[PDB]
């Protein structure tokens, strides 16, 4: 990482990017089934 900078994961809004169709994170079950979840579901499961 260049001097004066820090790495920020998945941009400004991570959860929105994960729920997007162009998400860099890909989850596959049963070999060939893609799994997609809305952003609100991930927000609910995150515990403060």
């Amino acid at each position: 990482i260049a001097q004066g900078y820090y790495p920020r994961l998945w941009g400004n809004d991570p959860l929105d990017l994960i729920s997007s169709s162009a998400s860099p994170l890909t989850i596959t079950a049963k070999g060939g089934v893609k799994i997609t979840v809305s952003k609100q579901d991930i927000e609910n499961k995150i515990i403060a």
Partner: protein
């Protein structure tokens, strides 16, 4: 050579509806490979 191959000795045909794999997030070929792996354990040894 397709006609020379034996097609009647211990061969079973499985006719499947294609509506099952009709889905936006389902890859039929990867899913089909997984299903064969799951079924193989209990399948008869001398059958195709």
């Amino acid at each position: 050579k397709y006609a020379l191959a034996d097609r009647f000795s211990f061969v079973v045909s499985m006719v499947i509806n294609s509506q099952l794999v009709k889905n936006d997030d389902v890859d039929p070929y990867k899913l089909e490979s997984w299903a064969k792996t799951e079924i193989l354990a209990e399948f008869p040894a001398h059958l195709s």
